[PDB]
Design a protein around this ligand. Sequence first.
Ligand SMILES: *[C@@H]1O[C@H](CO)[C@@H](O[C@@H]2O[C@H](CO)[C@@H](O[C@@H]3O[C@H](CO[C@H]4O[C@H](CO)[C@@H](O)[C@H](O)[C@@H]4O)[C@@H](O)[C@H](O)[C@@H]3O)[C@H](O)[C@H]2NC(C)=O)[C@H](O)[C@H]1NC(C)=O
Ligand SMILES: *[C@@H]1O[C@H](CO)[C@@H](O[C@@H]2O[C@H](CO)[C@@H](O[C@@H]3O[C@H](CO[C@H]4O[C@H](CO)[C@@H](O)[C@H](O)[C@@H]4O)[C@@H](O)[C@H](O)[C@@H]3O)[C@H](O)[C@H]2NC(C)=O)[C@H](O)[C@H]1NC(C)=O
Ligand SMILES: *[C@@H]1O[C@H](CO)[C@@H](O[C@@H]2O[C@H](CO)[C@@H](O[C@@H]3O[C@H](CO[C@H]4O[C@H](CO)[C@@H](O)[C@H](O)[C@@H]4O)[C@@H](O)[C@H](O)[C@@H]3O)[C@H](O)[C@H]2NC(C)=O)[C@H](O)[C@H]1NC(C)=O
Ligand SMILES: CN(C)CCCN1c2ccccc2CCc2ccc(Cl)cc21
Ligand SMILES: CN(C)CCCN1c2ccccc2CCc2ccc(Cl)cc21
Ligand SMILES: CN(C)CCCN1c2ccccc2CCc2ccc(Cl)cc21
Lengths: 130, 130, 130
Amino acid sequence: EAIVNAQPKCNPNLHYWTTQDEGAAIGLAWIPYFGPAAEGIYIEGLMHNQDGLICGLRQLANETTQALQLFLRATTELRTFSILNRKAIDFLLQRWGGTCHILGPDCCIEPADWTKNITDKIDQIIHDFV
Amino acid sequence: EAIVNAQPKCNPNLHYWTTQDEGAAIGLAWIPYFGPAAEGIYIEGLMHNQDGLICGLRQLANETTQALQLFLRATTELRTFSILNRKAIDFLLQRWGGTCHILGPDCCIEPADWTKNITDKIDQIIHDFV
Amino acid sequence: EAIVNAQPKCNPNLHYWTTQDEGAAIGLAWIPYFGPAAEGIYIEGLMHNQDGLICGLRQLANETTQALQLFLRATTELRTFSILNRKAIDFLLQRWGGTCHILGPDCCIEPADWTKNITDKIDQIIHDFV
Ligand SMILES: *[C@@H]1O[C@H](CO)[C@@H](O[C@@H]2O[C@H](CO)[C@@H](O[C@@H]3O[C@H](CO[C@H]4O[C@H](CO)[C@@H](O)[C@H](O)[C@@H]4O)[C@@H](O)[C@H](O)[C@@H]3O)[C@H](O)[C@H]2NC(C)=O)[C@H](O)[C@H]1NC(C)=O
Ligand SMILES: *[C@@H]1O[C@H](CO)[C@@H](O[C@@H]2O[C@H](CO)[C@@H](O[C@@H]3O[C@H](CO[C@H]4O[C@H](CO)[C@@H](O)[C@H](O)[C@@H]4O)[C@@H](O)[C@H](O)[C@@H]3O)[C@H](O)[C@H]2NC(C)=O)[C@H](O)[C@H]1NC(C)=O
Ligand SMILES: *[C@@H]1O[C@H](CO)[C@@H](O[C@@H]2O[C@H](CO)[C@@H](O[C@@H]3O[C@H](CO[C@H]4O[C@H](CO)[C@@H](O)[C@H](O)[C@@H]4O)[C@@H](O)[C@H](O)[C@@H]3O)[C@H](O)[C@H]2NC(C)=O)[C@H](O)[C@H]1NC(C)=O
Ligand SMILES: CN(C)CCCN1c2ccccc2CCc2ccc(Cl)cc21
Ligand SMILES: CN(C)CCCN1c2ccccc2CCc2ccc(Cl)cc21
Ligand SMILES: CN(C)CCCN1c2ccccc2CCc2ccc(Cl)cc21
């Protein structure tokens, strides 16, 4: 489904913070003893509403809440870190969880450039037929 | 291996409880503040011994214990939530962890309907040969 | 990249300890109540510097530290058990995260023994052509 922002307002710009997990450390800064404290590990950036992605993202986070809260109600884990990894596994299982029937709509195998490996190899034997 | 129930008795019916993780919530019931308490999140059902699955399941849980206890002895995690996700990964790695040699017994790729895409395409060029 | 041990010294032998997760238990030893205490769950072994793997491994662990410490700085998990499982997922996603274009350098599908299934099947119809 498409996402329809139905909020009273939308801040169209996203001034965000996150961590850089693979930081190009300078000298000893990667050593915990010498590195930044908890407050100084963040990077920042600014994103504008190109393609309406910011207003759509606000609505998406909004619409995600019901399913996320129901998932949290059903789990006994106190802190859940595994949602994205489980999504990655389900991505793979949806495509590769069974036999891949080539040309099938649910089999992600492209034999396009391989048919030209053999349709140029029709003149293998039918062209050279002295 | 097949499962042979070797227990003194078997309750052939399984009156079970579980959680519905994607619940079709009614109104505000998905909001933790308004929703059910810990005791009211469960659904119930009843399963009979069709195909002997209940008596087999009791024996399976029984026979699983040794390996499960040895796994728990070797882990340092206090609470283990990852067994099923690891099983899913190993499912994928067993089939897709290496090169898939088509027609091989360990490669789950079916080219059956794709050979008829090219065996009906023998009359491509051998039929139309004026 | 290759690994170049740049340490002051290298102990070329690895006297290691680990756990056997699938232990061939003898009798009741798998039962926690009867089994070994925390100090008696370990197996041991000895590895020599064949192919320079021990000296390389010491350097690898050394060189891994910066990236590992930066990963730990960016996570909010108190104890991280998921690095290897995430590596396995990324292994699969790198090969199977998109459409597999056969003969492509990033598609791990081998049609070698399947082309002989059809190149011996050129004499299907071109040999038997009465
Ligand atoms: C996702 O986005 C939705 C849209 O922004 C959010 O919807 C909000 O949902 C809550 C309920 O969960 C509503 O709060 C209720 O408000 C009503 C109406 O209050 C009105 O009453 C007076 C008198 O009639 C009226 O003059 C005012 O205009 C008030 O607005 C109360 O009766 C309820 O008791 C309850 O307080 C919000 O109104 C509703 N917003 C909108 C714009 O529909 C939703 O909460 C978001 N989800 C998350 C997880 O944040
Ligand atoms: C999986 O299913 C198995 C089968 O139901 C369970 O097997 C049970 O395993 C325990 C040991 O772990 C046994 O308990 C032992 O019982 C013996 C014999 O007691 C008998 O002794 C008197 C006098 O000879 C006899 O008259 C009675 O009939 C008694 O039965 C004791 O000597 C031991 O000290 C120990 O208590 C069970 O007997 C055994 N059951 C069966 C039916 O074989 C197994 O426990 C299940 N696994 C899990 C994890 O639940
Ligand atoms: C991975 O392996 C590397 C190589 O074994 C390790 O490199 C070590 O890194 C630390 C810094 O993190 C260095 O410690 C520094 O030492 C210098 C120099 O001390 C020298 O000074 C006197 C006077 O000049 C000299 O006579 C001596 O020979 C001393 O060696 C100090 O100035 C610093 O303050 C700091 O103490 C090590 O020297 C360095 N070792 C080598 C062999 O380069 C690295 O630590 C390993 N990584 C991990 C995570 O273990
Ligand atoms: C510039 N765009 C091409 C890529 C936008 C990246 N992006 C993203 C990706 C898909 C949909 C919405 C959004 C905008 C939100 C957001 C927030 C954080 C990060 Cl780290 C990326 C991110
Ligand atoms: C009706 N059967 C076709 C499907 C049975 C579902 N099932 C199951 C699946 C494989 C083998 C044994 C069992 C019976 C035990 C059990 C328990 C809970 C649930 Cl949520 C399903 C479940
Ligand atoms: C005998 N070698 C063929 C296999 C070595 C096994 N190995 C290993 C594998 C790849 C590279 C370095 C090392 C040596 C270190 C080490 C440590 C523990 C274990 Cl459990 C295996 C292990």
